[PDB]
Amino acid sequence: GESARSLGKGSAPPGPVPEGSIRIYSMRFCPFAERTRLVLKAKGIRHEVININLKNKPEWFFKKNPFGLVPVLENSQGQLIYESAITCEYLDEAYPGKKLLPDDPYEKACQKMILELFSKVPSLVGSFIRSQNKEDYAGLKEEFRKEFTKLEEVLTNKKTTFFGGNSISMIDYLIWPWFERLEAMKLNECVDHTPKLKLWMAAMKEDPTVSALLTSEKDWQGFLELYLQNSPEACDYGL
Amino acid sequence: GESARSLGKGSAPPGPVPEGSIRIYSMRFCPFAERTRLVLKAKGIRHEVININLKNKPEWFFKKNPFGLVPVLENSQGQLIYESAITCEYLDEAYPGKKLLPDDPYEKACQKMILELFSKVPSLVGSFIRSQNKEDYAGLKEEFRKEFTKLEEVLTNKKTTFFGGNSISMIDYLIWPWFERLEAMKLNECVDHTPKLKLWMAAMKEDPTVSALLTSEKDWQGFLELYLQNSPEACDYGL
Numbered sequence A, B: 001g002e003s004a005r006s007l008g009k010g011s012a013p014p015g016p017v018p019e020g021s022i023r024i025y026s027m028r029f030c031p032f033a034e035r036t037r038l039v040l041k042a043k044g045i046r047h048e049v050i051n052i053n054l055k056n057k058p059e060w061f062f063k064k065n066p067f068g069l070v071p072v073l074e075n076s077q078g079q080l081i082y083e084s085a086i087t088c089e090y091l092d093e094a095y096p097g098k099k100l101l102p103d104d105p106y107e108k109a110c111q112k113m114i115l116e117l118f119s120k121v122p123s124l125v126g127s128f129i130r131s132q133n134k135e136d137y138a139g140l141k142e143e144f145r146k147e148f149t150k151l152e153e154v155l156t157n158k159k160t161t162f163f164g165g166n167s168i169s170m171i172d173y174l175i176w177p178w179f180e181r182l183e184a185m186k187l188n189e190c191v192d193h194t195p196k197l198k199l200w201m202a203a204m205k206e207d208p209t210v211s212a213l214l215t216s217e218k219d220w221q222g223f224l225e226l227y228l229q230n231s232p233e234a235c236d237y238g239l
């Protein structure tokens, strides 16, 4: 398990990705990178993982991604792909197995429009972990409710188990990581007025790919406290 | 030409889109909607246009797009697609003719990553038209230069005429509308330190699709003054 320790400042740049594998630069508690890892697992793609210390980054990491953000994919041809949704779409197109995006152009566009309806939530979760008292908290809960209602309306018309149909698909994996963190953030009462979205969270936790990657509330809390301290040890919490 | 007048508050909701055509809800001076119109023209797609008065919207327009924004596509099946990049990608996949996106997954991802490098520019152009004096202007010019340098680096490695190759393609059409407005915004000196990007603007203006859709500096200025007044007549400037 210690082989999952992150690479930080001073680390040597890694060698080439072996043929037959793809590499993801990740961080174990990063929801953006969890998107890509959910897709790797759902499609059964052989891969290796390099975790980056996001509080003490290797200088060489900026050669993998100018933005210095995870996730990044690197394949055996030496190609580099970043931005979470871009990496996920690349993986769906480039590898065989279950297609997580519809072939139909409209239904694929529909998945993207649902992603747009979700698009304010990640920055809200940002504000939430910043929140300082019960007044800020009450305000944040109402902001989440407003965004959640948008998603509830989609499920209400479709009456499907998942956002893309009765089968879990790309859109579900793209939005899941922020809902995963909701509990531990004590934002679980925001889904009370959105019953279908609440049932959707239950179905997601039953998905084999989701379940395999889910982090315990306790581990997430450990990370978050160190993260909020700007600790160089946050990314390796538990190792 | 008066048939291009916008529909506003009080207008009747339109009837169905005829078979064999797709409809775009647009506005003549809107760069986000220009993306979609560039793609419609480049692919030779038969279409009709409904311009929306964005300062005095029809209530029914919120039934086409909850966000109340253009562009929106509506086809003869009654399907609705919004968000500029989503509409463009849908059109490329759903219609025949020149494919504006690569089939290759990596090269398609590369186009999307270039879009991400551009992603701060539209909100900057927003700030720019807000700018109040020569001090704000000097500051804005440096912000544009920083973003333009990112794009210059791409062209420097690729040494291609366009961002996706030697043939104009999706990525070029997606970023063009903001560069179109640069002149009239007096931001044309921002590309001085980015020579390849400057030559790219010249090549774009030579493209038949771009040229066909380009708005004169004078018309754009007329719109902008009314827009900045919150005029209900801004969207119909010149009609």
Ligand SMILES: *CC(=O)N(CCCNC(=O)C(F)(F)F)c1ccc([N+](=O)[O-])cc1
Binding pocket: A027, A029, A030, A031, A032, A033, A054, A055, A070, A122, A125, A126, A129, A178, A181, A227, A234, A235
């Ligand atoms: C990797 C990742 O997703 N992020 C950005 C989101 C961080 N916020 C949260 O996890 C949430 F708000 F709780 F959801 C990221 C970026 C940087 C670090 N870091 O350790 O410096 C961690 C996570």
Ligand SMILES: *CC(=O)N(CCCNC(=O)C(F)(F)F)c1ccc([N+](=O)[O-])cc1
Binding pocket: A109, A110, A111, A113, A114, A153, A154, A156, A157, A158, B063, B064, B065, B066, B080, B081
């Ligand atoms: C893809 C999807 O599920 N959407 C967005 C598609 C276009 N929107 C519409 O058709 C509109 F809502 F009528 F404008 C979606 C989003 C929301 C609902 N809903 O029941 O409110 C349906 C479909």
Ligand SMILES: *CC(=O)N(CCCNC(=O)C(F)(F)F)c1ccc([N+](=O)[O-])cc1
Binding pocket: B027, B029, B030, B031, B032, B033, B054, B055, B070, B122, B125, B126, B129, B178, B181, B227, B234, B235
């Ligand atoms: C349609 C469109 O793109 N917009 C948003 C961008 C507006 N800014 C500019 O045109 C730029 F900054 F100069 F580039 C839009 C939205 C609303 C209106 N409106 O008339 O209310 C116009 C344009």
Ligand SMILES: *CC(=O)N(CCCNC(=O)C(F)(F)F)c1ccc([N+](=O)[O-])cc1
Binding pocket: A063, A064, A065, A066, A080, A081, B109, B110, B111, B113, B114, B153, B154, B156, B157, B158
């Ligand atoms: C698609 C593209 O042109 N890109 C981004 C691809 C991945 N990035 C890289 O390979 C990296 F730059 F090495 F990290 C692109 C962007 C910028 C350049 N450049 O010459 O700086 C090349 C390619």
